[PDB]
Amino acid sequence: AYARTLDRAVEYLLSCQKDEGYWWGPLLSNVTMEAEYVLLCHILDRVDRDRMEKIRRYLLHEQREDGTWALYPGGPPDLDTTIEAYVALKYIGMSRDEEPMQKALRFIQSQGGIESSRVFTRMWLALVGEYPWEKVPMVPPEIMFLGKRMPLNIYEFGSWARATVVALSIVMSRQPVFPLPERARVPELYETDVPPRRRGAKGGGGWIFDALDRALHGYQKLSVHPFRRAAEIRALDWLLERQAGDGSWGGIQPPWFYALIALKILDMTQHPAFIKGWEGLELYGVELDYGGWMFQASISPVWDTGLAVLALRAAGLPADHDRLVKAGEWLLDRQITVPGDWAVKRPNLKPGGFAFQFDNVYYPDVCDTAVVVWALNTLRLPDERRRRDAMTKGFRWIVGMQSSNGGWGAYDVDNTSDLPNHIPFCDFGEVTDPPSEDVTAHVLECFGSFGYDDAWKVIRRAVEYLKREQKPDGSWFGRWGVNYLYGTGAVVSALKAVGIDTREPYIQKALDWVEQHQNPDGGWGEDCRSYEDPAYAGKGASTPSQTAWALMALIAGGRAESEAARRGVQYLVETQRPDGGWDEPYYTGTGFPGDFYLGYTMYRHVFPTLALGRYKQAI
């Protein structure tokens, strides 16, 4: 039945592979990447008229009938995204009179206008001189002086946040303004009678910081600031030391953009780091067939490749398949051997991790590392000298990365400090990098493939961690992939792989939960609204990925023979395309719970391929 389906899926995956041996599907986010890119261009005085057009077409193609833009396809209108999209469009050329402009603007005003937007949005506008700097929460360059164990020192923030902060402290220190041409000004964002609904810090605002902030803005107006220029340099240096091979910073857009702006403010426009940084942007840009152009929030080549291999190996391809060998060789050259920021909490730990993107040595992550090592373990490469070596290094690095509670975070160890979540500036997404169920599950499944079990202390501690984190209804929260189906799928398949008895009460309780959310069509679906509204838990339109996830949960838990199992397989067999792939008009990736969502192009093909390969084995 599914046999031919698997074959078609397999041959399709191989057609997607690049000549070098890796896989790389684009990463989908939301309109702000290009809206900010447009602003960035203006600031840097490098506007390409042609590029602006491809961006106009994109922003429009993304707008909905109501004239708004969302975070995820089918999601509620987002104020922030819509304001930035609007500002970009007005700058590009469109007048306030036009149909798209009107609808957008009316929604904006109905929300309290400019004053209801996140810090970033107001800051971007402040940069361009449309909003007053004194109303934007300050981040001083002096933050650079706080040592390692001191509260609020930069190493208490998550990887992503850290660089953004540093880069921004320089920008905030100078409060520069790049006036927009009179034609593109947006005073209309203030024109609203509706009371502004202000969003506070992610963990509730303390009056202390509120006071501290006001002090900072006051201090900002003094004629002299002792040790300021020295703090700026610390920030600049911190930046120059960590620039990525591709010219970015962390392989993500925020710090990369701010870094570039900071360098411009410092007259370093003709310095190598700037040059490289600017031209590196082109690699993250994508040309769309309808004449548009988008910008990727980040890139997933290592992730894609690693998962692809696992999918194909499970599908049935032999360990020495010449195609999977190219993949294997490519992966080996990707291993990081130098220390990174992580080394600040683990100085005696030997480097051996892997990053998400192509060239990002200072920020390897547990998720990627775990998958890669595991995927390597399943292969049969020519020089297993380097294969044995790489695995051991990756393995040991992961072990040494375990946190206090028994689980794992993405980039750092015990990045649990609660302090940062209360700052006035931090009103968008996660600011810290604490351990999570999914990263931990992936680590567990990695060790699992290596024969290790519940007997090993490392694993036990992790399992203890998972049992305590399990939701009342028996589900597991999805930190990096769209929710409970993601987490629960990852956890259960992990637990099985490490030797635990699938017969257990809590596991069965989860297994049952999966069956009770199966949609009529036979597949599973979970909308991004499940982070805001707990009613949407396990609810949403069926998707290839989310279906494949719940499938793996059941297959691992023994319920492979079950009805819900065969029913799901039908869904996949039927919904498959003639080329072998699947479609997925929905995002099943999570950036920041409730604030940022991602569309992992490859998930729709990779996961079902992996799930079916696993189903076939249960025979």
Side-chain angles (χ1 to χ4, degrees):
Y2 55 73
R4 205 192 64 125
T5 298
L6 240 178
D7 287 328
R8 282 179 156 206
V10 173
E11 66 179 79
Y12 181 68
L13 278 190
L14 297 169
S15 77
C16 278
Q17 180 183 20
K18 276 53 171 49
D19 302 75
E20 296 71 76
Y22 64 87
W23 277 266
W24 182 27
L27 195 60
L28 272 5
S29 68
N30 74 68
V31 169
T32 54
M33 305 295 85
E34 26 277 326
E36 284 156 34
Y37 176 95
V38 161
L39 287 187
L40 180 54
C41 289
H42 165 67
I43 296 185
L44 303 189
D45 208 14
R46 299 180 176 217
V47 187
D48 176 39
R49 269 288 125 200
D50 198 285
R51 176 66 61 79
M52 301 286 87
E53 274 303 305
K54 295 171 149 295
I55 284 182
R56 189 184 54 74
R57 292 203 248 290
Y58 168 74
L59 295 185
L60 261 27
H61 174 288
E62 290 297 307
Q63 187 181 30
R64 294 91 62 80
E65 289 191 83
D66 44 34
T68 69
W69 287 268
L71 296 190
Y72 46 115
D78 192 285
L79 180 58
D80 306 309
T81 308
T82 300
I83 294 175
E84 295 188 30
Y86 177 92
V87 182
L89 285 171
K90 191 163 182 181
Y91 178 79
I92 303 173
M94 305 222 311
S95 55
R96 60 179 306 181
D97 318 306
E98 311 191 51
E99 269 283 295
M101 299 307 267
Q102 290 295 352
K103 297 189 283 178
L105 216 196
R106 286 192 292 96
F107 167 66
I108 296 173
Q109 293 173 330
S110 76
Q111 302 297 286
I114 220 299
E115 299 288 352
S116 301
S117 55
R118 65 186 182 162
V119 178
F120 281 140
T121 308
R122 289 182 273 132
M123 185 195 79
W124 270 109
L125 280 156
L127 273 155
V128 106
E130 289 311 279
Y131 182 91
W133 268 110
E134 39 271 275
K135 309 227 290 179
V136 191
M138 269 278 304
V139 175
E142 288 84 4
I143 181 178
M144 288 310 288
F145 294 129
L146 310 172
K148 307 178 187 303
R149 90 260 71 206
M150 294 200 62
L152 275 208
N153 81 92
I154 67 178
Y155 292 89
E156 285 191 343
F157 298 68
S159 293
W160 58 87
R162 207 139 66 215
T164 308
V165 182
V166 183
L168 278 179
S169 75
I170 298 180
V171 192
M172 235 129 218
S173 174
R174 305 299 188 88
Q175 293 185 349
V177 164
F178 300 105
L180 285 177
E182 298 178 2
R183 191 200 63 73
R185 310 286 283 285
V186 292
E188 54 261 37
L189 304 179
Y190 292 92
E191 288 179 22
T192 289
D193 51 298
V194 182
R197 53 203 64 155
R198 214 174 302 107
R199 190 201 301 92
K202 286 289 294 185
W207 64 270
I208 325 174
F209 313 98
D210 181 32
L212 178 51
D213 194 78
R214 313 177 79 109
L216 288 173
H217 277 103
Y219 177 64
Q220 256 295 138
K221 301 195 176 184
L222 295 183
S223 186
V224 301
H225 313 86
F227 302 165
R228 180 75 117 198
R229 236 179 51 73
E232 290 184 342
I233 293 176
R234 295 285 294 281
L236 169 61
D237 290 344
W238 193 84
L239 288 172
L240 299 179
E241 305 179 359
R242 263 146 286 238
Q243 184 173 30
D246 50 29
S248 75
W249 269 274
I252 51 182
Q253 83 93 44
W256 188 356
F257 276 37
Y258 302 134
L260 279 170
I261 294 174
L263 292 177
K264 167 57 189 280
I265 300 176
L266 300 175
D267 277 350
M268 297 169 74
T269 50
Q270 34 206 168
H271 176 293
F274 178 94
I275 302 310
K276 177 65 173 195
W278 172 252
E279 61 179 50
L281 285 175
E282 289 298 335
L283 174 61
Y284 288 67
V286 180
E287 211 95 313
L288 296 169
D289 51 73
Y290 63 83
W293 183 85
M294 65 163 304
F295 187 97
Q296 291 171 101
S298 187
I299 62 191
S300 57
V302 182
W303 191 231
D304 290 336
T305 298
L307 290 176
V309 172
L310 288 183
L312 292 175
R313 281 302 276 89
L317 292 187
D320 48 40
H321 192 308
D322 60 280
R323 225 59 188 295
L324 299 181
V325 173
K326 297 265 290 181
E329 298 284 359
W330 184 82
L331 282 174
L332 291 176
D333 298 304
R334 235 45 53 203
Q335 198 166 31
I336 289 88
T337 57
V338 309
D341 275 7
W342 56 269
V344 154
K345 238 79 170 297
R346 287 293 197 272
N348 307 137
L349 184 55
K350 294 292 167 290
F354 288 87
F356 188 55
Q357 31 287 106
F358 282 123
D359 196 4
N360 185 31
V361 294
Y362 303 126
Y363 305 98
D365 70 86
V366 179
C367 251
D368 269 301
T369 310
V371 170
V372 169
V373 179
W374 171 9
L376 277 179
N377 185 30
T378 78
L379 300 174
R380 200 69 296 269
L381 306 172
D383 62 311
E384 30 58 74
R385 163 55 54 242
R386 203 166 65 125
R387 186 183 85 87
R388 189 67 87 282
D389 209 54
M391 293 195 286
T392 34
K393 293 182 174 184
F395 195 119
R396 295 187 194 294
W397 189 75
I398 297 171
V399 184
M401 282 301 288
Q402 183 169 25
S403 295
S404 293
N405 56 18
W408 275 264
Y411 302 111
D412 288 294
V413 178
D414 299 320
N415 194 258
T416 60
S417 178
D418 183 49
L419 244 299
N421 292 291
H422 308 309
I423 308 174
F425 178 85
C426 302
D427 66 347
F428 187 85
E430 302 296 292
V431 176
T432 59
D433 181 10
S436 65
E437 305 89 344
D438 40 313
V439 182
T440 304
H442 294 149
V443 174
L444 246 18
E445 202 155 2
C446 176
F447 296 154
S449 78
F450 281 116
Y452 294 82
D453 59 4
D454 194 34
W456 188 18
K457 292 195 292 184
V458 177
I459 293 179
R460 173 182 302 102
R461 308 190 63 235
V463 179
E464 290 304 310
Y465 167 68
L466 292 176
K467 291 195 292 182
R468 307 190 304 270
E469 288 299 320
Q470 180 172 36
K471 251 56 179 191
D473 54 283
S475 63
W476 271 291
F477 179 84
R479 173 54 187 81
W480 297 101
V482 183
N483 259 337
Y484 308 97
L485 278 171
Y486 183 58
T488 308
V491 173
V492 177
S493 56
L495 296 183
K496 197 287 186 307
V498 293
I500 308 302
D501 206 23
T502 58
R503 202 142 299 95
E504 296 281 316
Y506 70 122
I507 293 181
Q508 287 295 137
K509 190 184 181 182
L511 244 32
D512 283 334
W513 187 89
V514 167
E515 287 187 313
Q516 303 157 10
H517 292 71
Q518 184 166 24
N519 287 333
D521 51 42
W524 281 260
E526 185 164 22
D527 183 83
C528 292
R529 246 163 290 248
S530 56
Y531 289 93
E532 305 288 61
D533 172 28
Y536 271 109
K539 282 181 62 188
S542 288
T543 70
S545 61
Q546 296 180 313
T547 289
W549 291 343
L551 249 303
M552 295 186 295
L554 300 182
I555 297 179
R559 272 88 151 316
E561 213 58 65
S562 157
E563 247 297 286
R566 173 170 37 259
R567 274 272 305 301
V569 179
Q570 264 315 117
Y571 173 95
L572 295 177
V573 176
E574 298 170 350
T575 55
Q576 188 188 28
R577 278 196 270 124
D579 49 21
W582 283 265
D583 289 317
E584 198 175 81
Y586 299 115
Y587 284 1
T588 58
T590 316
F592 300 140
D595 280 304
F596 201 82
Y597 299 93
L598 311 166
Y600 283 86
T601 297
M602 295 286 120
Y603 278 13
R604 67 193 66 168
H605 314 305
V606 181
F607 280 115
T609 299
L610 170 62
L612 295 184
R614 289 188 159 197
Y615 184 80
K616 176 166 155 291
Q617 255 94 80
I619 269 104

